[PDB]
Design a protein around this ligand. Structure first.
Ligand code: BCB
Ligand code: BCB
Ligand code: BCB
Ligand code: BCB
Ligand SMILES: C/C=C1/c2cc3[nH]c4c(c3C)C(=O)[C@H](C(=O)OC)c4c3nc(cc4[nH]c(cc(n2)[C@@H]1C)c(C(C)=O)c4C)[C@@H](C)[C@@H]3CCC(=O)OC/C=C(\C)CCC[C@H](C)CCC[C@H](C)CCCC(C)C
Ligand SMILES: C/C=C1/c2cc3[nH]c4c(c3C)C(=O)[C@H](C(=O)OC)c4c3nc(cc4[nH]c(cc(n2)[C@@H]1C)c(C(C)=O)c4C)[C@@H](C)[C@@H]3CCC(=O)OC/C=C(\C)CCC[C@H](C)CCC[C@H](C)CCCC(C)C
Ligand SMILES: CC(C)=CCC/C(C)=C/CC/C(C)=C/CC/C(C)=C/CC/C(C)=C/CC/C(C)=C/CC/C(C)=C/CC1=C(C)C(=O)c2ccccc2C1=O
Ligand code: HEC
Ligand code: HEC
Ligand code: HEC
Ligand code: HEC
Ligand SMILES: [Fe+2]
Lengths: 332, 243, 323, 273
């Protein structure tokens, strides 16, 4: 029913505004132990040698690396993605160059995707960077994915109840509530705002008075839109494990300048970054995935904020492997 | 173009905001604060046109009241300061002054809707009783602030309009007279009644009713006033500072 | 220390009273009974209750609206009785999500809502007629009814007048526990922080006032219970020491005071305005104001603070940032 | 100078401390010791706002705000400019309130009535203590308190509420909000009933206490009683903070998440999950 003191608090606004994070220390810690499991970088290896595009038969992405450096990417990948299952999870045991198993072709496209995040999205991912581990965390199917409908639990390593199950229609709202930080906001903000770029997140007018020709009748955005933007933010809030004052001044949610924090702009680039992975990199993988992996509309699992953040403002608390594995970007 | 804007730098919202403030302060100053001045005014030592009330059981009464007689107050100025308190000359309780004071209410009996006397004893009220569970005090010994037994309860006085016990009648021992007390001064126990409001010696001087089985409005004050007067005038210690 | 103001020490029992109206004496139904425990903190007598046409009407339309809501709730969780009891707070019957203007929306999206509200509105109206009629019938003033009407008018404002004025049923309040609460955030955000609407401010300061006033007024009546200060009618028409000791308590504390009648005119007013200001605020919203914060910023009211963290430009303005 | 029925009540006594020294009236106002202490603590708090108000950027009464210190100052003395005035003001505010409260005990004792009002006035002074002292102490900093501005103290409340995602889901708040509506609802009933019996209309006769009771029996099937409704109000009124307080003090010290998720104790029970 409750959480014992002390409580960790910070300040994101001018003294006396009540803007800042409130963190339970015994949760803060629980998160660190989990994210500390991040395997350390494999020691740097011999630079000289021929490129693997010459050496090997089927290398369409990591050609420019010398064999020694190539195999270090192949161990690391297996650590992050499929350690329990080893190299054979992707590869034909007799033929490494073969694309028999579907996690190979998918890994290739992933491999490109990872280089794209670290090269074309530093406005969000900064110098911290993303690896295969940020989403996978030691398993081929990541813990936090998203289909074209809600699903429980949010962590797909825990056994769902019959009502939690997507076939069972009765649990629907409860599936929808736990994505919205337990709200009764009757809207699905992933499939609305993150699965593509067809919708606009801002609803508040930017003028005192109503602009003629859009402030009556069928020319208006229904109130529903407001509900939905709030829905998405409750999920952003819950995804990162923080609250609205970490990015807004509640006085005026619509206003930037002094009324927002640098984290909000960073939050803004996340939206465009998550949109750019779902459409162009993740959704189309339904042609490369077996049906056991697809949703009830044939969709491939896609990512939200939580996929990388898993309850923390920085994924793995700003853990970086950017310099250790440069082959994963940023690409000149 | 905008909805709700007007000439200059002025919009509908801006104008209703003034209207809201002016209606408010109109009402406060020009109504409610004049309705507050129907009692006690004009001042002594902006008034409204007087209001009459047509009474349920005959007659009318325009307020505020002006009585044909002004009662003498046995008090005395402390200091020559405009707002100096007043110290009692005589015995303040029986004089009925300060917290022992009474209002000049009508010498008429309060009346049920149908006509009957409202506040009457249970010896009169044969169709009333005490609800099973609660204590019947009739015959318990009432005990004062000093801890002395000041009498014995002898009847209760029910309000017949609301079905609510308002008074307790007790025979004062030694005096051969009864005397009413409000239940608000009575800690009702199983075996006794505690009245910390007045000493044993004082019960004898409680205001006497005019009739044994009924009580006038003025008499309800007089009696009620007495006990409230005792809270500051029981002993000489009760008037001074606590610390 | 008056223990009567804490609770009723001794309880009188008697024959039941009946104040005859000018009509509907034959429409009183039921045998009155007496709760001993109620009778310690209030009056023991429960019942009887008056029926009448308007009363039954306020039940037949009120039930009908409730039956329409619960049916659409049950729908929401595929009619699973345990997942009804569990999730109930979260269930709701919503207005239309899709913009249809004012044209009557489909049953599957806001049609059952608009119809749930009609039957609510007819029920609210029927009761009012009862609250008015029972006053007149017993030779009473209509003061209660008119205050009730103001509170009816606030429901009508937020229910169907404001959607009308802006021309979109989507703006209406859902039915359901958490859902009609969730509306309060949607509405405010869409129109720019209700903390910046002056008539919210009036609304809050009258509601806050009602707190203070009843608290203070209650404290004063109990405080003078020993002098039969609860007998408020006959204190009006024949001033007793009770309301002498009241008025003076206040006059020596805050410098002025009311009468025993007028202080009930302060409360009545202060209750009324809570709904009138609340109604005024709404009627302005969306018709003539769009963002109450920028309305306050324009009219130079809204406060300003320095930057704790560095001023953050709107990334949607930077050269070559996506849509 | 005096009400037509007032001279007979102006008697010495009731004073808790001071004796005859402070026991007097200035105009309609009673003084006493606490009436002096109030005046002292008002003037000291008023003069110290005004100092702070000049050092600020604006004098427009809506905009002005005298805020508390940053979180780094903890429970210690903060610079006069940078929060120290706010701390100064607090002490003066609490000093006058308590003095305004105790004064009313002196007025109560002289008139020989209950102490119910000042005892009802503590319930606000307590809720003021919940916000500016008890909660900051429970979170570690005076920088968690609300700033003293007319429009600004709202901005605090807004950010306070949104810190837990959706403050309406708060169960203490739900409690508190319900008592506000019901107490506001309860007053217009009581005001209206008392008015409707004394001011029937036309040349109609005033009605009785039986008329009151009949109305609410007819309308709602039950009538509380004259004396009782006044006990009901003070209770309805009081519980706006008495329960609210619990919803405020838990947010942070005893609860760090959002308030909707608190209702997962209900929601996530295994045998209907
Ligand atoms: C983000 C959330 C915001 C918000 C959004 C908001 C909105 C959108 C509106 C308000 C409104 C109001 N807000 Mg407010 N708010 C308030 C207080 C208030 C009220 C004083 C006022 C009127 C509402 C009311 O009394 O309804 C209680 C009484 C009602 C609803 C009337 C019911 C009476 C009816 C006759 C009874 C019907 C019952 C039937 C028996 C039921 C039968 C039904 C069946 C048939 C199904 C406080 C004290 C605070 C504080 C201290 O933080 C606050 C913060 C906020 N509000 C935030 C800024 N607020 C209203 C207002 O004043 O507009 C400007 C309003 O419209
Ligand atoms: C702008 C204002 C909005 C608003 C904002 C709001 C907030 C912020 C909160 C609520 C809350 C509530 N609102 Mg809500 N509201 C409600 C009803 C409710 C309740 C579910 C709940 C408690 C309120 C309360 O106690 O009132 C006063 C109650 C009265 C006057 C009736 C008292 C009944 C009494 C207890 C009966 C006792 C007799 C027994 C039944 C007899 C037992 C005998 C036995 C044999 C209705 C029916 C309506 C309309 C008009 O249909 C409405 C409109 C609004 N509310 C507006 C849209 N409301 C609270 C909640 O927890 O819900 C989520 C809450 O925190
Ligand atoms: C979570 C709770 C907070 C809150 C949330 C809140 C909201 C949401 C809203 C208000 C509003 C208001 N609040 Mg506020 N509040 C206020 C005072 C006020 C008023 C300025 C205003 C109207 C309320 C009203 O009429 O009440 C009833 C009492 C009446 C009617 C008696 C008359 C009092 C008079 C109006 C008060 C004027 C105070 C001045 C600032 C002067 C201060 C003294 C100077 C001269 C030294 C004080 C003095 C305090 C203290 C001392 O703690 C306080 C605490 C809080 N408020 C909490 C921190 N308040 C409303 C507003 O519009 O503000 C801009 C409003 O919408
Ligand atoms: C995001 C914003 C939310 C929010 C955030 C919020 C917070 C953070 C807190 C509340 C609290 C409360 N909210 Mg609010 N809220 C409320 C209502 C309320 C109050 C009933 C309750 C208690 C306020 C209080 O403690 O005052 C305090 C006022 C005091 C103590 C007055 C002090 C008076 C002082 C003793 C005397 C001052 C004297 C002057 C100086 C004299 C001037 C002299 C002149 C006149 C001569 C309503 C009706 C709504 C609606 C309708 O939506 C709402 C929505 C919201 N609240 C939003 C969802 N609310 C409080 C609560 O109880 O939380 C559970 C609270 O802590
Ligand atoms: C400042 C203004 C305030 C104010 C004022 C006033 N408020 C009044 C009056 C005044 C003056 C009265 O005249 C009238 C009344 O009588 O006084 C006791 C009334 C009322 N205020 C009620 C509720 C209320 N006020 C709220 C708010 C405010 N009020 C604001 C704060 C709120 C909130 C906050 O949500 C609520 C919930 C009802 C009790 C009553 C309407 C009854 C009705 O319209 O019922 C009609 C509906 C029914 C009869 C349906 C009953 C359902 C049956 C059981 C169906 C059977 C089910 C079956 C099993 C199906 C199968
Ligand atoms: C449920 C309980 C309710 C309740 C109950 C009762 N209420 C009472 C009594 C009871 C019983 C009385 O005995 C007493 C009184 O006399 O009756 C008029 C009183 C009173 N209720 C006042 C204000 C009031 N009640 C509020 C709320 C409720 N009341 C709730 C709802 C609110 C809200 C909600 O904001 C306000 C503003 C004053 C008028 C008065 C004290 C003034 C004082 O103590 O005198 C002396 C103090 C001054 C003259 C000014 C002090 C200046 C200080 C030193 C410096 C200011 C610092 C401050 C922090 C600045 C903040 C401003 C900023 C927010 C912008
Ligand atoms: C000049 C000088 C320095 C003198 C020194 C003496 C001294 C210490 C003086 C105090 C100075 C100060 C600070 C004075 C400030 C006085 C105050 C508190 C002013 C604020 C008053 C306000 C705004 C109150 C708001 C509440 C309100 C709406 C009140 C109006 C309605 C009234 C008057 C209600 C009081 C009232 C109630 C509540 C009843 O129930 C009742 C029942 C029966 C009869 C009468 C009454 C009655 O009068
Ligand atoms: C999927 C998650 C993989 C795991 C686990 C491992 N490898 Fe891999 N391999 C993968 C891809 C997508 C590719 C093509 C890379 C590209 O840039 O296009 C490869 C390729 C190789 C090769 C070259 C084969 C050839 O072309 O002849 C080798 C030799 C290789 N991989 C080795 C290897 C080892 C030893 C691994 C485990 C320790 C391992 N891989 C894991 C995808 C995946
Ligand atoms: C989040 C931003 C991701 C990062 C970083 C990487 N991957 Fe990924 N992966 C992601 C999604 C949304 C999916 C689809 C769900 C699914 O598992 O089908 C995947 C899937 C894979 C798979 C297929 C696993 C399977 O279905 O059996 C493989 C083999 C894989 N991913 C490999 C991989 C590699 C090599 C990465 C770094 C180069 C990498 N992933 C990063 C999300 C994300
Ligand atoms: C940063 C991590 C955020 C937190 C925490 C919250 N929100 Fe937010 N918000 C954020 C961004 C990046 C944006 C703009 C997105 C875009 O593409 O335009 C917003 C926007 C809003 C809005 C709309 C503002 C407008 O222009 O009209 C609202 C109403 C809003 N946010 C509310 C809100 C709430 C209620 C939050 C807590 C539950 C919250 N935000 C948290 C970033 C972040
Ligand atoms: C993995 C692919 C991510 C996804 C999906 C999202 N974010 Fe992210 N975020 C990610 C990294 C590696 C970092 C570190 C960069 C840094 O600033 O140090 C971040 C950072 C943020 C921040 C800033 C936190 C801070 O400065 O303390 C915010 C506010 C943020 N991210 C928000 C956010 C949102 C709203 C997202 C979904 C819409 C989102 N992120 C997705 C990695 C990834
Ligand atoms: Fe009253």
């Amino acid at each position: 029913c409750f959480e014992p003191p002390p409580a960790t608090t910070t300040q994101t606004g001018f003294r006396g505004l009540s803007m800042g994070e409130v963190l339970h220390p015994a949760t803060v810690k629980a998160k660190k132990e989990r994210d500390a499991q991040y395997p350390p970088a494999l020691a740097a290896v011999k630079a000289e040698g021929p490129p693997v595009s010459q050496v090997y038969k089927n290398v369409k992405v990591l050609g420019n690396l010398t064999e020694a450096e190539f195999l270090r990417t192949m161990t690391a990948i297996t650590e992050w993605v499929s350690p329990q299952e080893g190299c054979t999870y992707c590869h034909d045991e007799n033929n490494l160059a073969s694309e028999a198993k579907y996690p190979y072709v998918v890994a290739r496209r992933m491999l490109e995707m990872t280089r794209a995040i670290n090269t074309n999205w530093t406005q969000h991912v900064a110098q911290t960077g993303v690896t295969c581990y940020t989403c996978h965390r030691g398993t081929p199917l990541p813990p936090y994915v998203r289909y074209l409908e809600p699903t429980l639990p949010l962590n797909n390593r825990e056994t769902p109840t019959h009502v939690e199950r997507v076939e069972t229609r009765s649990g629907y709202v409860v599936r929808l509530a736990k994505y919205t930080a337990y709200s009764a906001l009757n809207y699905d903000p992933f499939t609305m705002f993150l699965a593509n770029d067809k919708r606009q997140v801002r609803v508040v007018p930017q003028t005192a008075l109503p602009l003629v020709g859009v402030s009556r009748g069928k020319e208006r955005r229904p109130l529903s839109d407001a509900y939905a933007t709030f829905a998405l933010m409750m999920s952003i809030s819950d995804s990162l494990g923080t609250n609205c004052t970490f990015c807004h001044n509640a006085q005026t949610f619509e206003s930037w300048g002094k009324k927002s924090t640098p984290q909000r702009a960073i939050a803004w680039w996340g939206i465009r970054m998550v949109r750019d992975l779902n459409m162009n990199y993740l959704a189309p993988l339904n042609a490369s995935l077996p049906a056991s992996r697809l949703g009830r509309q044939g969709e491939a699992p896609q990512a939200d904020c939580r996929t990388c953040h898993q309850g923390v403002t920085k994924p793995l608390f700003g853990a970086s492997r950017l310099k250790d594995y440069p082959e994963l970007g940023p690409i000149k | 173009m905008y909805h709700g804007a007007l000439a200059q730098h002025l919009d509908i919202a801006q104008l209703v905001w003034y209207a809201q403030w002016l209606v408010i302060w109109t009402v406060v100053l020009l109504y409610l604060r004049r309705e507050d001045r129907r009692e006690g005014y004009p001042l002594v030592e902006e008034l409204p046109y007087p209001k009459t009330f047509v009474l349920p059981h005959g007659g009318t009464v325009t307020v505020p009241r002006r009585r044909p007689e002004t009662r003498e107050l046995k008090l005395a100025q402390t200091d020559g300061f405009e707002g100096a308190p007043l110290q009692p000359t005589g015995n303040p309780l029986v004089d009925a002054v300060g917290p022992a004071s009474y209002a000049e209410r009508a010498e008429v009996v309060d009346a049920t809707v149908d006509g009957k006397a409202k506040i009457v004893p249970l010896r009169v009220a044969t169709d009333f009783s005490i609800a099973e569970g609660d204590v019947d005090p009739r015959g318990l010994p009432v005990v004062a602030a000093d801890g002395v037994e000041a009498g014995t309860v002898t009847d209760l006085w029910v309000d017949r309009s609301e079905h609510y016990f308002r008074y307790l009648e007790l025979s004062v021992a030694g005096s051969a007279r009864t005397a009413l007390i409000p239940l608000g001064f009575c800690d009702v126990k199983k075996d006794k009644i505690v009245v910390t409001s007045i000493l044993s010696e004082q019960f004898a001087n409680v205001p006497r009713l005019q009739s044994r089985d009924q009580i006038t409005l003025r008499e309800e004050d007089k009696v009620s006033a007495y006990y409230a007067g005792g809270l500051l005038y029981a002993t000489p210690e009760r008037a001074e500072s606590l610390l | 220390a008056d223990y009567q103001t804490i609770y009723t020490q001794i309880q009188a029992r008697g024959p039941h009273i009946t104040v005859s109206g000018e009509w509907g004496d034959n429409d009183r139904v039921g045998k009155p009974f007496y709760s001993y425990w109620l009778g310690k903190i209030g009056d023991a007598q429960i019942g009887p209750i008056y029926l009448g046409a308007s009363g039954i009407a306020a039940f037949a339309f009120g039930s009908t609206a409730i039956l329409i809501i619960l049916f659409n709730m049950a729908a929401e969780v595929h009619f699973d009785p345990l997942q009804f009891f569990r999730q109930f707070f979260w269930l709701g019957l919503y207005p239309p999500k899709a913009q249809y203007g004012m044209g009557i929306p489909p049953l599957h999206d806001g049609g059952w809502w608009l119809m749930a509200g009609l039957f609510m509105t007819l029920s609210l109206g029927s009761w009012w007629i009862r609250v008015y009629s029972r006053a007149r019938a017993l030779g009473l003033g209509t003061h209660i009814a008119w205050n009730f009407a103001a509170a009816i008018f606030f429901v009508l404002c937020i229910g169907c007048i404001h959607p009308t004025l802006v021309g979109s049923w989507s703006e209406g309040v859902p039915f359901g526990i958490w859902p009609h609460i969730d509306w309060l955030t949607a509405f405010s955000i869409r129109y720019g922080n209700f903390y910046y609407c002056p008539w919210h401010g009036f609304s809050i300061g009258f509601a806050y006032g009602c707190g203070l006033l009843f608290a203070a007024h209650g404290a004063t009546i109990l405080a003078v219970a020993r002098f039969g200060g609860d007998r408020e009618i006959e204190q009006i028409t024949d001033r007793g020491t009770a309301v002498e000791r009241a008025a003076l308590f206040w006059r020596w504390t805050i410098g002025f005071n009311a009468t025993i009648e007028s202080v009930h005119r302060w409360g009545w007013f202060f209750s009324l305005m809570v709904m009138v200001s609340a109604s005024v605020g709404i009627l302005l919203t969306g018709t003539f104001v769009d963002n109450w914060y920028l309305w306050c910023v324009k009219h130079g009211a809204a406060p300003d603070y320095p930057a704790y963290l560095p001023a953050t430009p709107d990334p949607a303005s930077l050269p070559g940032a996506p849509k | 100078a005096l009400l037509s029925f007032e001279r007979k009540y102006r008697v010495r006594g009731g004073t808790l401390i001071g004796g005859d020294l402070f026991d007097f009236w200035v105009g309609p106002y009673f003084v006493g010791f606490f009436g002096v202490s109030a005046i002292f603590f008002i003037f000291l708090g008023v003069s110290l706002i005004g100092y702070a108000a000049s050092q600020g950027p604006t004098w427009d009464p809506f905009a002005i705000s005298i805020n508390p210190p940053d979180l780094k100052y903890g429970l210690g003395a903060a610079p006069l400019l940078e929060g120290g005035f706010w701390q100064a003001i607090t002490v003066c505010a609490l000093g006058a309130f308590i003095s305004w409260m105790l004064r009313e005990v002196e007025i109560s004792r002289k008139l020989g009535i209950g102490w119910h009002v000042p005892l009802a006035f503590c319930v606000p002074i307590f809720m003021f203590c919940v916000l500016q002292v008890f909660r900051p102490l429970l979170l570690g900093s005076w920088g968690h308190a609300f700033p003293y501005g007319i429009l600004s103290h709202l901005d605090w409340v807004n950010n306070f509420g949104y810190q837990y995602l959706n403050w309406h889901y708060n169960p203490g708040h739900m409690s508190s909000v319900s008592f506000l509506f019901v107490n506001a609802m309860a007053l217009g009933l009581h005001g209206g009933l008392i008015l409707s019996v004394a001011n029937p209309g036309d040349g109609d006769k005033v009605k009785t206490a039986e008329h009151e009771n009949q109305y609410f029996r007819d309308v709602v099937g039950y009538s509380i009683g004259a004396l009782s409704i006044h006990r009901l109000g003070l209770f309805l009124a009081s519980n706006i903070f008495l329960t609210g307080a619990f919803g405020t003090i838990a947010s942070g010290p005893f609860w760090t998440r959002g308030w909707p998720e608190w209702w997962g104790w209900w929601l996530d029970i295994p045998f209907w999950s």
